[PDB]
Design an enzyme around this catalytic site. Structure first.
Site, PDB file in Angstrom:
ATOM      1  N   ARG B  31      65.267  -2.716  -0.225  1.00 40.29           N
ATOM      2  CA  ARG B  31      64.204  -2.369   0.674  1.00 40.29           C
ATOM      3  C   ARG B  31      64.498  -1.015   1.419  1.00 40.29           C
ATOM      4  O   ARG B  31      63.536  -0.251   1.857  1.00 40.29           O
ATOM      5  CB  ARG B  31      63.903  -3.588   1.540  1.00 40.29           C
ATOM      6  CG  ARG B  31      62.756  -3.416   2.459  1.00 40.29           C
ATOM      7  CD  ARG B  31      62.742  -4.685   3.599  1.00 40.29           C
ATOM      8  NE  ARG B  31      62.055  -3.986   4.431  1.00 40.29           N
ATOM      9  CZ  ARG B  31      62.006  -4.513   5.943  1.00 40.29           C
ATOM     10  NH1 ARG B  31      63.087  -5.298   6.226  1.00 40.29           N
ATOM     11  NH2 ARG B  31      61.431  -4.092   7.065  1.00 40.29           N
ATOM     12  N   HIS B  35      61.950   1.996   1.737  1.00 44.02           N
ATOM     13  CA  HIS B  35      61.331   2.414   3.028  1.00 44.02           C
ATOM     14  C   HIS B  35      61.851   4.089   3.286  1.00 44.02           C
ATOM     15  O   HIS B  35      61.151   4.632   4.093  1.00 44.02           O
ATOM     16  CB  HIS B  35      61.296   1.492   4.173  1.00 44.02           C
ATOM     17  CG  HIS B  35      60.427   0.589   4.061  1.00 44.02           C
ATOM     18  ND1 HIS B  35      60.119  -0.229   5.077  1.00 44.02           N
ATOM     19  CD2 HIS B  35      59.569   0.156   3.105  1.00 44.02           C
ATOM     20  CE1 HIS B  35      59.289  -0.992   5.036  1.00 44.02           C
ATOM     21  NE2 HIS B  35      58.768  -0.706   3.707  1.00 44.02           N
ATOM     22  N   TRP B 175      59.561 -14.891  -2.572  1.00 44.35           N
ATOM     23  CA  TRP B 175      58.634 -15.087  -3.610  1.00 44.35           C
ATOM     24  C   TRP B 175      58.731 -16.029  -4.985  1.00 44.35           C
ATOM     25  O   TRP B 175      57.766 -16.544  -5.512  1.00 44.35           O
ATOM     26  CB  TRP B 175      58.157 -13.716  -4.100  1.00 44.35           C
ATOM     27  CG  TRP B 175      57.743 -12.873  -2.996  1.00 44.35           C
ATOM     28  CD1 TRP B 175      56.303 -12.400  -2.816  1.00 44.35           C
ATOM     29  CD2 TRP B 175      58.287 -11.887  -2.063  1.00 44.35           C
ATOM     30  NE1 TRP B 175      56.411 -11.610  -1.494  1.00 44.35           N
ATOM     31  CE2 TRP B 175      57.574 -11.388  -1.252  1.00 44.35           C
ATOM     32  CE3 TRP B 175      59.913 -11.663  -1.716  1.00 44.35           C
ATOM     33  CZ2 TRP B 175      57.656 -10.422  -0.203  1.00 44.35           C
ATOM     34  CZ3 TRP B 175      59.942 -10.870  -0.794  1.00 44.35           C
ATOM     35  CH2 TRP B 175      59.289 -10.325  -0.022  1.00 44.35           C
TER      36      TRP B 175
HETATM   37  C1  HEM Z   1      52.196  -3.011  -1.107  1.00 45.39           C
HETATM   38  C2  HEM Z   1      53.281  -2.656  -0.632  1.00 45.39           C
HETATM   39  C3  HEM Z   1      54.450  -3.413  -0.135  1.00 45.39           C
HETATM   40  C4  HEM Z   1      54.257  -4.323   0.986  1.00 45.39           C
HETATM   41  C5  HEM Z   1      53.015  -4.621   1.813  1.00 45.39           C
HETATM   42  C6  HEM Z   1      55.292  -4.806   0.965  1.00 45.39           C
HETATM   43  C7  HEM Z   1      55.528  -5.813   2.016  1.00 45.39           C
HETATM   44  C8  HEM Z   1      56.944  -6.398   2.629  1.00 45.39           C
HETATM   45  C9  HEM Z   1      57.335  -7.431   3.458  1.00 45.39           C
HETATM   46  C10 HEM Z   1      56.096  -7.843   4.553  1.00 45.39           C
HETATM   47  C11 HEM Z   1      58.519  -7.673   3.408  1.00 45.39           C
HETATM   48  C12 HEM Z   1      59.273  -8.606   4.271  1.00 45.39           C
HETATM   49  C13 HEM Z   1      60.236  -8.157   5.219  1.00 45.39           C
HETATM   50  C14 HEM Z   1      61.058  -9.043   6.057  1.00 45.39           C
HETATM   51  O1  HEM Z   1      60.307  -9.742   6.744  1.00 45.39           O
HETATM   52  O2  HEM Z   1      62.311  -8.946   5.932  1.00 45.39           O
HETATM   53  C15 HEM Z   1      59.095  -7.053   2.141  1.00 45.39           C
HETATM   54  C16 HEM Z   1      60.187  -7.268   1.732  1.00 45.39           C
HETATM   55  C17 HEM Z   1      60.893  -6.905   0.638  1.00 45.39           C
HETATM   56  N1  HEM Z   1      60.208  -5.720  -0.176  1.00 45.39           N
HETATM   57 FE1  HEM Z   1      58.110  -5.038   0.241  1.00 45.39          FE
HETATM   58  N2  HEM Z   1      56.528  -4.617   0.206  1.00 45.39           N
HETATM   59  C18 HEM Z   1      55.715  -3.555  -0.494  1.00 45.39           C
HETATM   60  C19 HEM Z   1      56.404  -2.888  -1.598  1.00 45.39           C
HETATM   61  C20 HEM Z   1      57.830  -3.072  -1.886  1.00 45.39           C
HETATM   62  C21 HEM Z   1      58.365  -2.259  -2.761  1.00 45.39           C
HETATM   63  C22 HEM Z   1      57.547  -0.987  -3.911  1.00 45.39           C
HETATM   64  C23 HEM Z   1      59.629  -2.542  -3.062  1.00 45.39           C
HETATM   65  C24 HEM Z   1      60.341  -2.019  -3.930  1.00 45.39           C
HETATM   66  C25 HEM Z   1      60.781  -0.905  -4.876  1.00 45.39           C
HETATM   67  C26 HEM Z   1      59.729  -3.481  -2.199  1.00 45.39           C
HETATM   68  C27 HEM Z   1      60.896  -4.305  -1.790  1.00 45.39           C
HETATM   69  C28 HEM Z   1      61.042  -5.359  -1.097  1.00 45.39           C
HETATM   70  C29 HEM Z   1      62.413  -6.100  -0.781  1.00 45.39           C
HETATM   71  C30 HEM Z   1      63.593  -5.849  -1.808  1.00 45.39           C
HETATM   72  C31 HEM Z   1      62.166  -7.027   0.025  1.00 45.39           C
HETATM   73  C32 HEM Z   1      63.150  -7.939   0.445  1.00 45.39           C
HETATM   74  C33 HEM Z   1      64.303  -7.468   1.519  1.00 45.39           C
HETATM   75  C34 HEM Z   1      65.136  -8.629   1.963  1.00 45.39           C
HETATM   76  O3  HEM Z   1      65.207  -9.707   1.263  1.00 45.39           O
HETATM   77  O4  HEM Z   1      65.661  -8.577   2.996  1.00 45.39           O
HETATM   78  N3  HEM Z   1      58.571  -3.842  -1.434  1.00 45.39           N
HETATM   79  N4  HEM Z   1      58.246  -6.225   1.603  1.00 45.39           N
HETATM   80 MG   LIG Z   2      62.478   9.029   5.164  1.00 51.53          MG
END
Ligand code: HEM
Ligand SMILES: [Mg+2]
Ligand code: HEC
Ligand SMILES: [K+]
Lengths: 102, 268
Positions: B31, B35, B175
């Site tokens: 993540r 970002h 998820w």
């Molecule tokens: C439509 C676009 C995306 C949305 C709206 C989205 C949204 C989110 C949200 C709301 C979380 C929860 C964060 C938290 O509360 O810790 C999250 C976690 C995460 N997302 Fe996304 N995400 C998107 C795309 C992506 C993409 C493109 C990747 C990677 C290539 C990604 C990788 C991750 C990972 C690895 C986590 C988990 C982090 C953790 O476990 O601490 N996300 N995302």
């Molecule tokens: Mg930057």
């Protein structure tokens, strides 16, 4: 393997699907107490897939090593949604922890 | 291949060791790198992607980047042990190691990213995607980054690992049932479960009716609602090897946005 590292890996990789306690509850996956050296598809109360039920494999430490590296390649049709443990040291550690469950 | 000024072999092993002590760090590292690249705008040519510009204000305080100080402080210890690597390269390599460590693809690593000097190179707020929105917003963001729909769906597939935290996004839970594993299970989960309203979370999210332990955001379920995205969800749910290859290519393209003349690092 190291039993301590094996238990911690099991908590971090198996706990959402499997219980390890004697007479533990069936959930996403079956209870795995006493599974080392058992035939596949025989835990009481669990509804296995067609592949795991009809399988002929015995869960010896060497067979568990191949399965845990890539479950869907070793047993096609399995419903175990696990990415696998790519490193031998972590597989060996997890297998050593399963051997302590009587 | 070209040898970097840092010992990449010892560094790759130390990242795996750090992740083995706390498996929840793996998804967090992915993540962080995503970002740091998601600030980009290919039409306005700004945002300073893949330059570790998130270490400074105002970018570090954006709502979308809440919680990303954890993977940043975890990697500061490795920056001291390996001073020759830039923070930008370190965040990308750490994400690549976590992907491979959790069972995902081996992404070939290119080195040479230059770090941002201060916060004056940061992009504005509102670039990061919002979990409460659907396909129009998701397509707008990924089109602004320069990705097609196939690449967009492959990349959101990273939600196979990790979880939502109430304190960072207001959402809660994982998820899939193998949150510290990297495979196509986000897509099989998205198609195989009946996603029902979760009445226990104030921010609207769905839960699997089979166990109620999993979750999907409105932005995750919009992949089923859109005719183009649904076909890629179906493709990846059926072929994990194809998912691994398409994710490797898209994640490599993501982490190389706004970069110039990088060097191919040696394998393993
Ligand atoms: C439509 C676009 C995306 C949305 C709206 C989205 C949204 C989110 C949200 C709301 C979380 C929860 C964060 C938290 O509360 O810790 C999250 C976690 C995460 N997302 Fe996304 N995400 C998107 C795309 C992506 C993409 C493109 C990747 C990677 C290539 C990604 C990788 C991750 C990972 C690895 C986590 C988990 C982090 C953790 O476990 O601490 N996300 N995302
Ligand atoms: Mg930057
Ligand atoms: C849910 C996503 C799981 C995770 C994570 C793990 N396992 Fe699993 N396992 C799961 C299911 C649904 C099943 C039944 C599969 C079927 O096709 O019917 C299993 C089965 C096993 C077995 C075989 C049990 C038997 O034959 O009685 C073993 C040995 C096993 N699982 C081991 C195992 C280990 C060691 C895991 C973490 C390292 C692990 N599983 C994770 C579902 C899931
Ligand atoms: K997973």
């Amino acid at each position: 393997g190291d039993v301590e590292r094996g238990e911690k890996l099991f908590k971090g990789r198996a706990a959402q699907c499997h219980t390890a306690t004697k007479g533990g509850s069936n959930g996403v996956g079956p209870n795995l107490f006493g599974i080392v050296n058992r035939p596949s598809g025989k835990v009481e109360g669990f509804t296995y897939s067609k592949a795991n039920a009809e399988s002929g494999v015995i869960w010896t430490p060497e067979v568990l090593d191949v399965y845990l590296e890539n479950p869907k390649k070793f047993m096609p049709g399995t419903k175990m949604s696990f990415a696998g443990i790519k490193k031998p040291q972590e597989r060996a550690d997890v297998i050593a922890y399963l051997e302590t469950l009587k | 291949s070209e040898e970097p000024p840092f010992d990449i072999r010892a560094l790759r092993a130390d990242i795996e060791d750090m992740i083995s002590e706390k498996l929840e760090l793996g998804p967090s590292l992915i993540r962080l790198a995503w970002h740091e690249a998601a600030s980009y705008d290919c039409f306005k040519k700004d945002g300073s992607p893949n330059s570790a510009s998130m270490r400074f204000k105002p970018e570090c305080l954006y709502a979308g980047n809440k919680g990303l100080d954890i993977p940043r402080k975890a990697l500061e210890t490795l920056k001291k042990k390996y001073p020759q690597i830039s923070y930008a390269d370190l965040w990308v390599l750490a994400a690549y190691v976590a992907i491979e460590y959790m069972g995902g693809p081996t992404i070939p690593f290119c080195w040479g990213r230059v770090d941002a000097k201060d916060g004056s190179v940061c992009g504005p707020d509102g670039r990061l995607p919002d979990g409460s929105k659907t396909q129009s917003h998701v397509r707008e963001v990924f089109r602004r980054l320069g990705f097609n729909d196939q690449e967009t769906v492959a990349l959101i597939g990273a939600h196979t690992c990790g979880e939502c935290h109430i304190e960072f996004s207001g959402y809660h839970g994982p998820w899939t049932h193998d949150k510290n594993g990297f495979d196509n299970s986000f897509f099989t989960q998205l198609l195989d479960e009946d996603w029902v309203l979760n009445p226990k979370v104030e921010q609207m999210q769905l839960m699997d009716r089979a166990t109620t332990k999993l979750m999907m955001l409105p932005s995750d379920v919009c992949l089923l609602l859109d005719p183009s995205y649904r076909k890629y969800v179906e493709l990846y749910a059926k072929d994990n090897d194809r998912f691994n290859k398409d994710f490797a290519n898209a994640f490599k393209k993501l982490t190389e946005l706004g970069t110039r003349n990088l060097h191919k690092a040696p394998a393993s």
